[PDB]
């Protein structure tokens, strides 16, 4: 149906995009970057993340496909050489949609902003020490002191979460995972020191203790927030949908990205 | 209805057990340790684990309650001082049952044994180096070399799993978590180096590479298995049921066991 | 001889400082904050670090003493209640000096700045991804990608180094320790993934790969450096000297700060 | 002078050994496996460790050389293809000896055994839970509960130590490093949770708390010790000497074994 293609913008990805557009022109496929139903991202995982955020208001109407023109990017299902086969399979249709969970971040001030993450949302201080009270379902759980906190989706667990020692979670699990960045632990300061995995409908709230200014990232996007009263995390009701044309199981995707390929 | 009480066996737990039996005698409660419907464990988490295994064939007919006579044992909901209040609340009934997921381990030979775990199942070598191929849903994922592997239930994630760097998982999540014990990683040997969290219906199979003898633990119970062809892990269809008389959320239980109490 | 006293500046530390100055006035002790031979820091480890940096040009002429007015600060040897005993012991003299190793950081541009650290020197990016080549004694060792790097002195190993998973090193060992902050490791990116401990006379050089702007911290002090060609680390030839009046072994100091007190 | 050659015993290593013996026969080199001055190990690091232990009573009279016939074994300096060049260089002599530190383990009973380690000494329980008091220079430092403890030499820090999260230490540093295996940490049980690095002349003593039977390994060799009163660790006064014919710096050796080669 209606589709669009985003490109990383180097010569290789732009040319692949032009060639796929020409192939789509041989079928009943209209290029429409306002209301696409298929969004193809040609590049790396950053390109894919940007495509997701370009269309985060129409996630229920869109299925995503990623082509990696660099290394195997984690959200990519296709190598450039297979682009023509993808054009054909997509043109016919009847593919199967797979959905991954997303993370909702709410930032309250003294007003309210919400963000959606496909990989993770992180919070750090705007310069001074980072100290927050971590409140789970209204239960005061710990006072965190350290460099920051990372809350990850299942598909994000192989990203920043992994570098911070988090568990890799299969994306059929509707959960979010909280990991610590360089927590201090001594006689007077104590944190849990393990990643925490939360189900859908649990709410994790971070509440400032002294400083109220924080640097909050959502996927690639980092923003300074001033005068914050609360940062709230929960599994979103929204999901991202992928078009799948063949089996590529998550654990094989993990194997291919981290073990050998 | 029918109940029984297991005790750690020290003077404090035996006397509490005798006093609770006397209190139950004032209600319509028959002591029956063949077909109980309520199993009370008085001791620590080891006592509770032994009670679970004493009745693992009647898990669908039983609700468990733990009293800790030492430190706050993780599966315990009651301190000894509250025993009389428990007798009363239990006598009336109408309490709410909560269920935690369990782990099924299958060991195949050259014959087949199955075990059920509430905390975890671990595998180590019987003396020589431990090397196994890890196969996930028939996908060859890694060759593990190291000291051993631990597969944990959600409620077990605060136990051995935690010491091995695993994530703590809320027990409403029907999953199991695989953690590494001292994996070797160099130019020639590679493992994933993160805990892995698996949903229900995924099967993780360990397949021997050289040595076929393994020491397999299920909760406290360690057994030498010889001539092993495969060890298979999956989330069990069986669940353990707890009798709950008041709110004691898992994350508060974690707070009280690890942060402060 | 000549001494001075720095204070954290709260009411408790200022009053202790005034009372110690009055006690010193009863001996042959001149207050001199230009050329002291004894520097007393009253506060926490931050106060002590600031005192060290206030006098880093006269380290060979100075012995430091720390009083902690908060929790046991790691560099502190005295509680406030013992201040009068310290005045007396110090007045007589004949105490023993103990020396800890220090870290030299050199930052080269396209010009050169040097810094001395008692705890550690860290490097992060000024916004974009952090990528540096790590060169040890002119040997290209790894390309580091992640959040940053921390180089610690022995006495700093219980500070930020510890939170990053580094080893605690006894300060009689003339060494520095490099730890990673959230390194990425996948099929294409590889780091050593262990802390590294370097002897005196080894030089660790960080060399930019793309971005040349870095945020470099030395103890509490964080500075944006632009147009960096190289950051070089080595154990300094300079040492910090403490006045010791009684045994307080490093491993007891560690026990008291992290295990119980 | 007098030399001997140990072989892993596969066809490749036995033939290399025979060919080197024939080459040595063309010089003033006597084969003597009672009092060698050069010990050549042909195989892997296990072969090298066995050669070290075969001659641990004559370490001051011996220089070791390792040839790896498998992967780059860490203690190996030569590939098989260079064997003839080694014969020649060794025949002439005038090579430089390099020394690495060693670890002394003393096991006291209710009698005394001492062992020397090139990689590490580990202690685990003989079946039950492992609990020991850790005493550093007669200072009670922690009660360790977990799977076991590993004490490593500098050259051993890239071995089991590395898998347990220890730091890699340059072998010019006369030290030993203690790492934890799966320590338990909760409200009631506390360990330091970081590797500890000890200088020469510090003594680390492990003292049993309940069970007195332990499985103690020294390099590859694992032994059940019963009725143990104390296990004591210290940097040995003895050193192992390597014959070096060219530069192969430790950090390049680490790079080649863990980063790429
Ligand atoms: C620009 N990034 C796009 C992405 C991605 C991604 N998504 C997954 C995925 N879901 N699964 C597996 N691989 C995944 N990638 C891979 O991550 C590498 C990213 N490049 S980078 O980190 O060097 N960089 C900052 C340039 C690259 O290989 C890419 O294919 C943002 C993301 O970086 C992540 N990030 C930030 N700081 C990090 C840290 N210190 N360690 C590890 N990740 C870190 C964070 O998650 C953010 O959303
Ligand atoms: C006899 N154990 C009973 C239990 C339990 C338990 N269950 C949870 C829970 N679900 N949540 C939180 N606390 C939990 N406990 C607490 O664990 C301490 C156990 N005593 S012990 O490990 O010292 N020991 C071996 C005497 C004690 O406080 C108890 O209340 C067996 C279990 O030990 C575990 N175990 C074995 N080796 C371990 C390692 N190296 N590190 C950590 N745990 C280890 C393994 O899980 C096994 O099933
Ligand atoms: C203001 N700091 C002074 C100090 C110190 C110190 N020196 C040692 C020592 N040698 N041994 C043991 N305790 C030590 N302290 C203790 O560290 C706590 C510091 N307060 S703080 O980190 O919360 N903060 C930023 C307000 C406090 O208890 C103090 O007594 C700077 C230092 O923070 C360190 N730092 C920065 N980020 C950190 C992270 N994420 N985790 C851990 N440390 C971190 C870094 O080393 C810097 O030099
Ligand atoms: C038979 N080993 C000989 C050796 C060695 C060695 N010495 C160093 C060195 N100094 N530097 C870098 N590489 C090093 N090797 C490499 O270690 C691999 C060993 N094979 S093995 O561990 O699979 N095995 C048990 C068959 C192999 O590549 C070899 O070249 C005993 C040693 O294994 C170590 N060991 C035991 N359990 C371990 C764990 N869980 N993780 C990691 N190491 C473990 C322990 O140190 C013991 O002394």
Residues 6 or more apart in contact with residue D196 via CB below 8 angstroms: C167, C168, D177, D178
Distance of CA D44 to the CA centre of its chain: 13
**Residues followed by a break in chain B, C–N over 2.5 Å?**
110
Q: Are residues A106 and A232 in the same domain?
A: yes
Would you state the structure tokens that stand for residue B66, as one six-digit string? 């733990």
Q: Which residues of D touch B (CB under 8 A)?
A: 71-72, 127, 146-147, 160, 162-164, 181-188, 222, 256-261
Among B68, B70, B61, B64, smallest CA distance to B51 is for B64
Interface touch A136/B177, C-beta < 8 Å: no
Residue nearest to atom 45 of ligand 4 (CA): D160
Distance CA B198, CA A171 (A): 9
Resolution in units of Å: 1.7
Smallest Cα distance from D128 to chain B, Å: 10
Q: Are residues A184 and A69 in the same domain?
A: no
Q: Are residues D125 and D112 in the same domain?
A: yes
Place of tokens 């209301």: A35
Q: What is the DSSP letter of B165?
A: T
Distance CA B132, CA C52 (A): 54
Contact D257, B187 (CB under 8 A): yes
Q: Which residues of A touch B (CB under 8 A)?
A: 136-137, 139-142, 162, 165-170, 172-173, 175, 177, 190-192, 194-199, 202, 249, 251-252, 254-255, 258-260
Residue C53 burial class via C-beta count within 10 angstroms: exposed 0-12, middle 13-18, buried 19 and up: middle
Contact B116, B104 (CB under 8 A): yes
R_g of chain A computed on alpha carbons: 20
Distance of CA B21 to the CA centre of its chain: 27
Q: Are residues A224 and A245 in the same domain?
A: no
Distance CA D27, CA B111 (A): 62
Among A218, A126, A129, A225, smallest CA distance to A182 is for A129
**Chain B residues lying within 8 Å of D149, measured CB to CB:** none
**Chain C residues lying within 8 Å of A71, measured CB to CB:** 187-188
Interface touch A183/C160, C-beta < 8 Å: no
Would you state the structure tokens that stand for residue A93, as one six-digit string? 């249709």
For residue A66, what are the β-bridge partners? A41
Q: What is the 3-state secondary structure (H, E, C) of A115-148?
A: EEECCEEEEEECCCCEEEEEEECCEEEEEEEECE
Among B61, B80, B83, B56, smallest CA distance to B1 is for B61
**Residues followed by a break in chain A, C–N over 2.5 Å?**
110
Q: Are residues B179 and B124 in the same domain?
A: yes
Interface touch D182/B188, C-beta < 8 Å: no
Q: What CATH number corresponds to the domain at position D199?
A: 2.60.200.30
Interface touch C195/D168, C-beta < 8 Å: yes
**Chain B residues lying within 8 Å of D256, measured CB to CB:** 187
Q: Are residues C225 and C107 in the same domain?
A: yes
Task: For residue D210, count other CB atoms closer than 10 A to its CB.
Answer: 10
Q: Are residues A168 and A255 in the same domain?
A: no
Residues with CB under 6 A from ligand 1: A 44-46, 49, 73-74, 119-120, 155-156, 158-160, 163, 219-220, 257; C 129, 145-147, 182, 184, 186
Which residues of B belong to the active site? 45
Nearest CA in chain C to A223: C127
- Pick from B184, B185, B189 the residue to mutate for probing ligand 4's pocket: most ligand atoms within 8 Å of its CB: B184
Place of tokens 């698996």: B198
Distance of CA C260 to the CA centre of its chain: 24
Q: What is the DSSP letter of B166?
A: P
Q: What CATH number corresponds to the domain at position D73?
A: 3.40.50.10330
Ligand 3 center–CA C159 separation, angstroms? 5
Distance CA C196, CA D254 (A): 11
Q: Are residues D34 and D94 in the same domain?
A: yes
Q: Are residues C40 and C111 in the same domain?
A: no
Quick check: helix, strand or coil at residue B13? Answer: helix
Smallest Cα distance from A9 to chain B, Å: 33
Nearest CA in chain A to C255: A187
Would you state the structure tokens that stand for residue C127, as one six-digit string? 């916004």
Distance CA B72, CA B256 (A): 8
Contact D90, D243 (CB under 8 A): yes
Phi, psi of C25 (to 5 degrees): -60, -15
Would you state the structure tokens that stand for residue B64, as one six-digit string? 């468990």
In the residue annotation, C14 being an active-site residue is answered as no
Residue nearest to atom 42 of ligand 2 (CA): B160
Contact C254, D142 (CB under 8 A): no
Beta strands in D14-160 (DSSP E): 30-31, 38-43, 63-68, 96-108, 112-117, 120-125, 130-136, 139-146, 148-152
Phi, psi of D151 (to 5 degrees): -115, 125
**Chain B residues lying within 8 Å of D71, measured CB to CB:** 187-188
β-pair type (D168-169, C196-199): parallel
Would you state the structure tokens that stand for residue C261, as one six-digit string? 């007190």
Domains contained in chain A, number: 2
For residue D216, what are the β-bridge partners? D123, D223
How would DSSP label each residue in D193-252? Answer: -S-EEEETT--EEEEESS---EEEEETTEEEEE-S--EEEEEEEEEEEEEEESS---HHH
Helix (H) or strand (E) holding B231: strand B230-244
Q: Which parts of chain C fold into alpha helices (H)?
A: 11-24, 45-54, 83-92, 160-163, 250-258
Quick check: helix, strand or coil at residue A26? Answer: coil
Residue nearest to atom 9 of ligand 4 (CA): D159
Among B13, B102, B99, B106, smallest CA distance to B56 is for B102
- CA distances in angstroms from A9 to A5, A17, A154, C131, listed in the order given: 11, 10, 28, 22
Contact C106, C218 (CB under 8 A): no
Residues 6 or more apart in contact with residue C21 via CB below 8 angstroms: C5, C31
Q: Please give the number of the atom of ligand 2 that sits closest to the Cα of B162.
A: 42
A127 lines ligand 3 (CB under 6 A): no
Would you state the structure tokens that stand for residue C115, as one six-digit string? 């810094």
Interface touch A254/B137, C-beta < 8 Å: no
Beta strands in chain C (DSSP E): 2-7, 30-31, 38-43, 63-68, 96-108, 112-117, 120-125, 130-136, 139-146, 148-152, 168-169, 175-181, 196-199, 204-208, 214-218, 221-225, 230-244
Residue B171 burial class via C-beta count within 10 angstroms: exposed 0-12, middle 13-18, buried 19 and up: buried
Write out the residue range of the structural domain in which residue C93 sits.
1-101+238-260
* Length of chain C, in residues: 261
- CA distances in angstroms from A69 to A41, A66, B76, B189, B197, listed in the order given: 10, 10, 54, 29, 30
Q: Are residues D249 and D215 in the same domain?
A: no
Nearest CA in chain D to B257: D187
Contact C27, C43 (CB under 8 A): no
Starting at the edge strand that comes first in sequence, how are the strands of the sheet with C168-169 ordered?
C168-169, D196-199, D175-181, D148-152, D120-125, D214-218, D221-225
Q: Are residues C126 and C225 in the same domain?
A: yes
Among B118, B135, B156, smallest CA distance to B231 is for B135
**Chain B residues lying within 8 Å of A260, measured CB to CB:** 190
Chains that touch D (3 or more CB pairs under 8 A): B, C
Phi, psi of D252 (to 5 degrees): -70, -40
- Pick from B6, B8, B41, B45 the residue to mutate for probing ligand 2's pocket: most ligand atoms within 8 Å of its CB: B45
Q: Are residues B45 and B132 in the same domain?
A: no
Start-to-end C-alpha separation, chain C: 34
C222 labeled part of a ligand binding site: no
Interface touch D184/B163, C-beta < 8 Å: yes
Task: For residue C199, count other CB atoms closer than 10 A to its CB.
Answer: 18
Residue nearest to atom 37 of ligand 2 (CA): B160
Helix (H) or strand (E) holding B143: strand B139-146
**Chain C residues lying within 8 Å of A76, measured CB to CB:** none
C155 labeled part of a ligand binding site: yes
Place of tokens 């001075």: C4
For residue B97, what are the β-bridge partners? B243
**Residues followed by a break in chain D, C–N over 2.5 Å?**
110
């Amino acid at each position: 149906m209606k589709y669009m293609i985003t490109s990383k913008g180097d010569e290789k990805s732009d040319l692949l995009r032009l060639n796929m557009i020409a192939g789509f022109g041989e079928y009943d496929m209209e290029y429409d970057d306002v209301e696409p139903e298929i969004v193809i991202s040609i590049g790396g995982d950053g390109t894919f993340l940007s495509a997701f955020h370009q269309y985060e208001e129409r996630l229920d109407e869109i299925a995503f496909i990623g082509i990696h023109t660099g290394h195997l990017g984690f959200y990519a299902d296709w190598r450039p050489a297979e682009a023509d086969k993808l054009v054909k399979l997509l043109a016919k249709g009847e593919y199967q949609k797979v959905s991954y969970p997303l993370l909702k971040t709410t930032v309250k001030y003294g007003k309210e902003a919400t963000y959606l993450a496909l990989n993770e949302s992180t919070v750090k201080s705007s310069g001074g020490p980072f100290v927050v009270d971590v409140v789970i379902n209204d239960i005061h759980f710990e006072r965190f002191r350290g460099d920051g906190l990372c809350m990850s989706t299942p598909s994000g667990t192989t990203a920043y979460n992994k570098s911070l020692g988090g568990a890799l979670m299969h994306p059929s699990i509707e959960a979010m995972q909280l990991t610590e960045m360089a927590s201090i632990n001594n006689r007077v300061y104590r944190t849990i020191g393990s990643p925490l995995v939360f189900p859908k409908h649990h709410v994790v709230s971070l509440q400032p203790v002294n400083d109220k200014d924080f640097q909050i990232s959502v996927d690639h996007l980092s923003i300074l927030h001033r005068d914050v009263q609360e940062i709230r995390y929960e599994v979103s009701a929204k999901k991202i949908h992928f078009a799948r044309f063949r089996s590529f199981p998550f654990w094989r995707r993990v194997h291919d990205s981290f073990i050998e390929d």
